[PDB]
Design an enzyme around this catalytic site. Structure first.
Site, short mmCIF file in Angstrom:
data_model
loop_
_atom_site.label_atom_id
_atom_site.label_comp_id
_atom_site.label_asym_id
_atom_site.label_seq_id
_atom_site.Cartn_x
_atom_site.Cartn_y
_atom_site.Cartn_z
CG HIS A 101 45.42 38.85 38.56
ND1 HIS A 101 44.69 38.15 37.61
CD2 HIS A 101 44.91 38.50 39.76
CE1 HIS A 101 43.81 37.39 38.23
NE2 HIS A 101 43.92 37.58 39.53
CG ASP A 154 41.20 35.13 39.84
OD1 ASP A 154 40.95 35.83 38.85
OD2 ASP A 154 41.86 35.57 40.80
CD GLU A 204 40.12 36.66 43.46
OE1 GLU A 204 39.30 36.00 42.78
OE2 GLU A 204 40.60 37.73 43.08
CE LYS A 239 41.72 40.39 45.30
NZ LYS A 239 40.88 41.33 44.49
#
Ligand SMILES: [Mn+3]
Length: 203
Positions: free
Chosen positions: A77, A112, A126, A144
């Site tokens: 990721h 994020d 995200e 998400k």
């Protein structure tokens, strides 16, 4: 003295642009060689960025990486999206404060990215990945959104929030951002290289 901070209030509400399917258009593009070595904490990675043509997918990739043993589980990721944001534990609460009198779980969620502008808008972004196909990617994106919608909705009463998602699969991206072909290509290219590295790293 920043004058954009002196505007009349904006509408306090959650905005979500629709998700879109994008496909990579990479084709025969060189993929750099990598050399993985044991280190003190985990692994060192050496990426042969010299092998990449000028103006080709992969130009954001850096030649060297340190992955500590505690970070190998997140490598895929984080490498994939490393040209857009660095890893963070920046929580909702750092930006909005606690919501009612008492702190709760949604205060400590950490998407994020949480970007706040002078005009007082807030952007939650995200990232996520899937080993399956475009349908898998669409589903990952919707998960998400479900993970963070409640926290975003409650805080949009404080500052308006737009919620964005990027979900990468092997052949494209599902995202509600408005992405160019190069931008889709870079994400997918970095994902494909992260997959190759990860299979040797888990080993
Ligand atoms: Mn993520």
């Amino acid at each position: 003295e920043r004058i954009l901070k002196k505007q009349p209030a904006p509408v306090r509400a959650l905005t979500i642009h629709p998700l879109r399917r994008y496909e990579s258009s990479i084709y025969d593009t060189p993929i750099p060689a990598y050399v993985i070595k044991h280190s003190s904490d985990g692994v060192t990675i050496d990426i042969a960025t010299s092998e990449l043509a000028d103006g080709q997918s992969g130009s954001t990739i850096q030649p060297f990486e340190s992955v500590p043993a505690q970070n190998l589980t997140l490598f895929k990721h984080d490498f994939t999206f490393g040209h857009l944001a660095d890893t963070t534990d920046k929580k909702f609460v750092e930006v909005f404060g606690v919501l009612e009198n008492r702190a709760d779980d949604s205060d400590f969620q950490s998407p994020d990215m949480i970007i706040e502008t002078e005009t007082g808008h807030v952007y939650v972004v995200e990232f996520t990945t899937t080993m399956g196909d475009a349908n898998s990617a669409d589903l990952a994106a919707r998960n998400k959104i479900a993970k963070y919608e409640i926290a975003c909705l409650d805080r949009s009463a404080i500052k308006p929030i737009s919620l964005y998602i990027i979900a990468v699969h092997f052949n494209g991206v599902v995202s509600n951002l408005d992405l160019s072909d190069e931008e889709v290509n870079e994400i997918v290219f970095r994902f494909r290289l992260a997959r190759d590295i990860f299979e040797e790293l888990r080993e």
